[PDB]
Design a protein around this ligand. Structure first.
Ligand SMILES: NCCOCCOCCNC(=O)CCC(=O)NCCC[n+]1ccc(Cc2sc3ccccc3[n+]2CCCS(=O)(=O)O)c2ccccc21
Length: 231
């Protein structure tokens, strides 16, 4: 399963940009495509997405007016257009496949590597965390009843200069490939990611996330920079 987004684009203020992404080697029609952006040095912001079967698009309220998401089933290609470009809109624009696995049918999540385009509610996380290799650290995520209280929590790892990767879904489930030293949990309006037997490769940004019934949008945490201190 393979994502290819459009090449990096410099753009004039006031204009509009269409980012594309093409997906290969799966059932395109069975995926939800979502779009998430990240300004340099900053966090994640859901713009919107399509849902399968119905083919209907939906949008984060800060972007209503300005965004048109569209999907071409023929070419297995999603498109995101945002207009009225300001400097604030400078960001890496990620397309994200959401789906269920073929055999067991559990959730999964695949992020494109992002299109840099050159020209805000969030869950609470501590800004930083650290440990020496072998140690255990726990990263916390705090929200409210309308999000973490009522909805499934995901955790995303983000290595420097790379796209987020799903670590935990459905509060405590690990995708295939994720080591059992990562553990998820939630209780009330609060969630936790536990990392045991810490390794240098874990130096990364960790984001919790969940849907919010009040806002009617997908909400990321402020993120936690985990520094693995030698040694
Ligand atoms: N007077 C009116 C007052 O009352 C309102 C009544 O009127 C009706 C109110 N209307 C509704 O019920 C709308 C509900 C609905 O299904 N929307 C369509 C879809 C909207 N959506 C879109 C997207 C997501 C999840 C997303 S977006 C995304 C982007 C990147 C990475 C992950 C990611 N993820 C994670 C998904 C995994 S999990 O599910 O969280 O584990 C949703 C998650 C849950 C529910 C809806 C979701």
């Amino acid at each position: 399963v393979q994502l290819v987004e459009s090449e990096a684009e410099v753009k004039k203020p006031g204009s509009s940009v269409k980012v594309s992404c093409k997906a290969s080697g799966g059932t395109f029609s069975s995926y939800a495509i979502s779009w998430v952006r990240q300004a340099p040095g900053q966090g994640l912001e859901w713009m919107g997405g399509t849902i399968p079967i119905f083919g209907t698009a939906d949008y984060a309220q800060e972007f209503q007016g300005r965004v048109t998401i569209t999907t071409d089933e023929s070419t297995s290609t999603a498109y995101m257009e945002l207009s009225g470009l300001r400097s604030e809109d400078t960001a890496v624009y990620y397309c994200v496949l959401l789906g269920t696995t073929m055999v067991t049918g559990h959730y999964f999540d695949y992020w494109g590597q992002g299109t840099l385009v050159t020209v805000n509610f969030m869950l609470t996380q501590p800004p930083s965390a650290s440990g020496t290799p072998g140690q255990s650290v726990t990263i916390s995520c705090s929200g409210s009843g309308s999000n973490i209280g009522n909805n499934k929590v995901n955790w995303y790892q983000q290595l420097p200069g790379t796209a987020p990767k799903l670590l935990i879904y459905s509060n405590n489930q690990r995708p295939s490939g994720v080591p059992d030293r990562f553990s998820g949990s939630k209780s009330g309006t609060s969630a936790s990611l536990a990392i045991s037997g810490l390794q240098s490769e874990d130096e990364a940004d960790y984001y919790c996330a969940a849907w919010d019934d009040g806002l009617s949008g997908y909400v990321f945490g402020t993120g936690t920079k985990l520094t693995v201190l030698a040694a």
